[PDB]
């Protein structure tokens, strides 16, 4: 550990933007659409769409862990604490060569294969007061989730029920104990944000996460169900996360696509409610892959040599 006190701001961390831009370029030479459409305006309202048609090679895009080592004239500083807001003065900081192996998983609503919370479930937010700022949840115990191009994902109803609890409890432990915690599905928006979207085998899965976010701080949902089955769908025409615009990928082909990932975290986003009675409603969120990266770099910060 480094014997000094420094400031950290994962919400304004620059490595996030440095990885994000990398992960995008890690996408332009691995997953290339058959056609990519992107807004093109002079400002005069009228906006032509810039079209691009390239080969559409079916590649089973399988993410490789990524390290981030400071070159020279530069040093990475890691923060150490069982519960770090990731936005303030860190006491147990410590210089490191490369950040832990991170598997740049691009997804929405659920953070897959990320890094678990050592102690307990932690939830960071650039401002919990602002019903506009994504709440990044960090699970201390991942929940396996298996998706298949066959059309769905299975999740443990047990583990997910617990998780919502040990999350619902960490929420009120920030918005007011004497406050009811509820979970509802997406409010609306793009398919990629409304469902738990992500990529598996180069196939863009779109799983309906209603059964994962319709939890009332009162009842249950395990009648005749041992596992939660999200009705997933693979799309060819998708909205790009790298930049405003659609993109069409070629249909599936491999006799079988399969994924078994660790739900290591979520991206929630409680609704304003305009100071109404203690009844905070949290819904799935994300779509801004940087929050993802953040959830992984929340405790890092590269700095110039002295």
């Amino acid at each position: 550990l480094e014997n000094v006190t420094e400031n950290f701001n994962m919400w304004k961390n620059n490595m996030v933007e440095q990885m994000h831009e990398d992960i995008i370029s890690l996408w332009d030479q691995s997953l290339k659409p058959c056609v990519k459409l992107t807004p093109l305006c002079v400002g005069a309202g009228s906006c032509n769409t810039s079209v691009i048609t390239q080969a559409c090679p079916k590649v089973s895009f399988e993410p490789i862990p990524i390290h981030y080592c400071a070159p020279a004239g530069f040093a990475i500083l890691k923060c150490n604490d069982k519960k770090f807001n990731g936005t303030g003065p860190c006491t147990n900081v410590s210089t490191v060569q490369c950040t832990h192996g991170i598997r740049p998983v691009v997804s929405t609503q659920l953070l897959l294969n990320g890094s678990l919370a050592e102690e307990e479930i932690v939830i960071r937010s650039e401002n919990f007061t602002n019903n506009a700022k994504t709440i990044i949840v960090q699970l201390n115990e991942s929940v396996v989730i298996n998706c298949t191009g066959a059309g769905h994902c299975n999740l443990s109803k047990t583990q997910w029920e617990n998780t919502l609890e040990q999350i619902a409890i960490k929420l009120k432990e920030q918005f007011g104990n004497n406050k009811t915690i509820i979970f509802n599905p997406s409010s609306g928006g793009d398919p990629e944000i409304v469902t738990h979207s992500f990529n598996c085998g180069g196939e863009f899965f779109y799983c309906n996460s209603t059964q994962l976010f319709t939890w009332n701080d009162t009842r249950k949902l395990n009648n005749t169900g041992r596992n939660i089955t999200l009705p997933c769908r693979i799309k060819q025409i998708i909205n790009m996360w790298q930049e405003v615009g659609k993109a069409m990928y070629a249909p599936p082909i491999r006799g079988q696509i399969r994924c078994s990932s660790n739900i290591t975290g979520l991206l929630l986003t409680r609704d304003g409610g305009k100071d109404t009675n203690g009844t905070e409603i949290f819904r799935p969120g994300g779509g801004d892959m940087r929050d993802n990266w953040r959830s992984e770099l929340y405790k890092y910060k590269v700095v110039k040599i002295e």
Partner: antibody, heavy 128, light 110 residues
Framework: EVQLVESGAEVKKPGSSVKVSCKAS????????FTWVRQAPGQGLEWMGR????????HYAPHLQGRVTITADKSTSTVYLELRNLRSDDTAVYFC?????????????????????WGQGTLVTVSS | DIVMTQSPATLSVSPGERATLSCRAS??????LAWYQQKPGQAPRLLIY???TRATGVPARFSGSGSGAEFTLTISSLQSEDFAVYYC???????????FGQGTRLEIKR
């Protein structure tokens, strides 16, 4: 199960431009990708291009790029094929052809090259 | 740039008999190959697609065979109505640059 209807046969003169219509009915328009296939008398099919309707993108035949365009009016449910700078050889029966693509209005898209549904065909005579 | 050549420019055969057509392709077109049938003065007719799969509502006598650059639309007991020119369509490259065969007339030999 769609039924494609085309505009009337037109007699255009050299160096001009022609626009053939193609009414698509009987199913979900945006779920189809339409292709124009021309055929000169005595000659055989020649791929003119295809419009991935829903996306409003269309790719064309090498020997036509520049002088041809394919557009679709989702409102009226029509597809159009425009050839400009008409030559005599362009004289042919221009066919309108389409294929189902899948729940394209839902992100699903097979992007099929073959053509399951064909038009009645529109003849265009480009001569002086 | 793909050339699709239908070797049998013309095939004279009699009803009930078995007629065979062969479409030759430049480079490999995998299985993105369809077959069409055209009666004089009619829009083509999608017979086979994906090389070996008949289009909805088509006589089982039409056999779609092949893969790569060698396809074959073989027909068992040819029928009176089976007289027409046959066309193979290549639609495997992308960007889209589909090409048609030059044809084959399935004329009745008498």
């Amino acid at each position: 199960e769609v039924q494609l209807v085309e505009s009337g046969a037109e007699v255009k003169k050299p160096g001009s431009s022609v626009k053939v219509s193609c009414k698509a009915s009987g199913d979900t328009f945006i779920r189809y990708s339409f292709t124009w296939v021309r055929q000169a008398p005595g000659q055989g099919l020649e791929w003119m291009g295809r419009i991935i309707t829903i996306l409003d993108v269309a790719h064309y035949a090498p020997h036509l790029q520049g002088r041809v365009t394919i557009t679709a009016d989702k409102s009226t449910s029509t597809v159009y094929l425009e050839l400009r700078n008409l030559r005599s050889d362009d004289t042919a029966v221009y066919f309108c052809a389409g294929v189902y693509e899948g729940e394209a209005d839902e992100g699903e898209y097979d992007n099929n090259g073959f053509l399951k549904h064909w038009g009645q065909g529109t003849l265009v005579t480009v001569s002086s | 740039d793909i050339v699709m050549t239908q070797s049998p420019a013309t095939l004279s055969v009699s009803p009930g008999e078995r007629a065979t057509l062969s479409c030759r392709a430049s480079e490999s077109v995998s299985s993105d190959l369809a077959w069409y049938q055209q009666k004089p003065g009619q829009a083509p007719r999608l017979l086979i697609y994906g090389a070996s799969t008949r289009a909805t509502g088509v006589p089982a006598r039409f056999s779609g065979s092949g893969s790569g650059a060698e396809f074959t639309l073989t027909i068992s007991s040819l029928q009176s109505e089976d007289f027409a020119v046959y066309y193979c369509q290549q639609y495997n490259n992308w960007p889209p640059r589909y090409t048609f065969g030059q044809g084959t007339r399935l004329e009745i030999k008498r």
